[PDB]
């Protein structure tokens, strides 16, 4: 019942729907298979980079501020807990 | 002297000179040449306060 109490709640998706509902079930799966914070950054920058081509960035902490420079609709913002799940992909 | 001989013989080294003129041209070359940016490679930081 653990997936249903967590309710990661997307503050800004720039993205197709069902490419962010895929996303969803990754951030929430890579949360509890990653022991730490660190861990969950490498594990959904290569589950990204086999799903999908290209150079990924992926920051997730506590508190912090980000401008990026990313490939148009490749950018998803989703909040869990006090982890971000941020990935944006530059060309 | 017959119509065509006068013909040849008004034909004269200095009446008619023919020269050769040619343009210098480059060789063909056929070169490969391959560009490749350089190595990138993965960084992985985390910041905490006490560190």
Redesign the interface.
């Known amino acids: 019942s653990h997936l249903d109490k967590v309710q990661p709640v997307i503050k800004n998706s720039d993205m197709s729907v069902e490419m962010q509902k895929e996303v969803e079930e990754v951030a929430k799966k890579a949360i509890d298979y990653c022991n730490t914070?660190?861990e969950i950054?490498?594990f959904i920058?290569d589950d990204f980079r086999s799903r999908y081509h290209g150079?990924w960035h992926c920051i997730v902490?506590r508190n912090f501020g980000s401008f990026v420079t990313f490939e148009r609709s490749y950018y998803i913002y989703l909040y869990v807990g006090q982890l971000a799940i941020l990935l944006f992909k530059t060309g | 002297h017959d119509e065509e001989a006068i013909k040849q013989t008004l034909r004269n080294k200095f009446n008619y000179n023919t020269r050769e003129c040619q343009t210098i041209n480059p060789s063909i070359r056929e070169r490969g040449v391959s560009t490749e940016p350089p190595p990138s490679d993965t960084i992985c930081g985390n910041i905490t306060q006490w560190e």
Do not use: S, V
């Open positions: 914070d660190k950054a490498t920058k150079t902490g």
